[PDB]
């Protein structure tokens, strides 16, 4: 019944700030944060995700496997329990979720594969694990739709300065360039193959966010309603 | 409907001899053999089972918490099969594990930890990775019972030279030393407090394997009977 709707988009490209404006608008939707989001400022996950999430920074090749399968745990046991839990007696519940388990796969995952931070070994490994989770653990996780925040990785690398995350600063450009492109080959130009069927009829609607929408956001969310009437 | 029985016990005690024997004595009875077996000795789980096995004696405290999921996964995975491609119908169905979730995380995760090849993180994780894995995926694995197979770790040396196998050939002896150590506290002295309450509750039969009885074990198997009666 609740309508699950991921968040796609780059770093700094403006998730966080787009789902927490979503949120407040109406009382039947809800967000599930990225809960890497959280690891980056006290539970078990948070130390264990604050620990991987440096020794990911300091040494890629050895913390890659490790971090991405704790990243995409973490992220289904979030998202499980806000369908759960959130929305409760809702007439028009929407579920909106910061990135997904296929972001996390066919973006971060891929990219540290292809980047050489983990062998074969490990990306098949990675894949299998992902492939069976999604099976007998992740079923009610499939999305309806995706929003694409789409910027060029130029405006990307502009908000990171913004926020001021002493790890991320150290991020470079061509880094930006080649989630981009995984993004568009994803999600624009829907090129990608994927193991999950379903995806290539999932609807996606695609907004250009390079221009501020902090205080200008209507427009946006106007697309927003018009995609998900169509749901 | 289908008893579920764990066969316990150190490297090369035997378990693989007994539930081979217990399998052709009943179409009751029926196996499911180790992965972590299955890769010693070739479908897309067992390359990857060949290699992070390689490597895992290559270095250890490099590949122990990638081994320790795969293994883990590979084997909840394993049993669901046989636990739902099998014994159907039948009237007094039992499926008989080769070792269990239990072992994978109190006997060889606990001791890799132990011995320094995973650090917290990396522990923690798995922990927090198993409590999840087994839950959220595996409630219909609970043991009704676990049959433990008591062999010196100079027998094992014995037999692991016997096996043949020089991938795990020169096992040092004070290896099969502690993981002796660690079966006998969990199941004979009963000190070891799982995170499964019940484990502490299920009835556990112990079995002398030091003797040959490959050609004579008439009395391990009436013992066996014995004990499923009792479930
Ligand atoms: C060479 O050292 C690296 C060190 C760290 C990274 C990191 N990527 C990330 C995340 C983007 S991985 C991630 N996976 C997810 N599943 C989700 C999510 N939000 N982030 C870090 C937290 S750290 C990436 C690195 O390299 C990427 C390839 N080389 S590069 C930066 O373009 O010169
Ligand atoms: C120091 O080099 C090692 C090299 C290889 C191992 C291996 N352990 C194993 C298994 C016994 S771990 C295992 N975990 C499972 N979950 C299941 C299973 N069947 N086996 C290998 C297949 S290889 C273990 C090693 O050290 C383990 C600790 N030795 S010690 C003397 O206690 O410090
Ligand atoms: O329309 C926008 C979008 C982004 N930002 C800034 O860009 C940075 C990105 O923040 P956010 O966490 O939302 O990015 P995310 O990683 O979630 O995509 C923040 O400092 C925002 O203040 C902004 O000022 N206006
Ligand atoms: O009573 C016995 C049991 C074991 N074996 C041999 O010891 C080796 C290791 O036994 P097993 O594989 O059953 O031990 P496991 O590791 O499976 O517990 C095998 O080659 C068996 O042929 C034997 O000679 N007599």
Avoid at 127 to 132: I, M
Avoid at 161 to 177: M, V
Avoid at 189 to 210: A, C, G, M, S
Wanted: hydrophobic content about 35%; charged content about 25%.
């Amino acid at each position: 019944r609740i309508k699950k709707i991921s968040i796609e988009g780059n770093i700094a490209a403006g998730k966080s700030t787009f789902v927490n404006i979503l949120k407040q608008l109406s009382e039947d939707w809800e967000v599930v944060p990225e809960p890497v989001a959280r690891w980056s400022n006290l539970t078990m996950e948070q130390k264990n995700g604050g620990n991987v999430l440096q020794m990911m920074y300091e040494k890629p090749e050895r913390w890659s496997f490790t971090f991405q399968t704790y990243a995409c745990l973490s992220r289904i046991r979030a998202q499980l329990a806000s369908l759960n839990g959130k929305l409760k007696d809702a007439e028009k519940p929407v579920l909106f979720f910061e990135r997904s388990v296929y972001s996390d796969r066919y973006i971060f995952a891929s990219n540290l594969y292809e980047s050489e931070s983990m062998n074969e070994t490990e990306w098949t490994i990675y894949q299998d694990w992902h492939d069976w989770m999604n099976n007998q653990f992740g079923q009610s996780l499939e999305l309806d739709g995706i929003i694409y925040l789409q910027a060029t990785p130029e405006t990307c690398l502009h908000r990171i300065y913004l926020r001021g995350r002493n790890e991320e600063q150290g991020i470079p450009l061509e880094y930006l360039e080649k989630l981009h492109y995984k993004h568009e080959s994803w999600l624009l130009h829907r090129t990608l193959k994927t193991n999950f069927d379903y995806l290539q009829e999932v609807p996606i609607l695609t907004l250009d966010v390079n221009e501020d929408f902090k205080d200008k956001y209507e427009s946006l969310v106007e697309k927003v309603k018009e995609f998900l009437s169509t749901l």
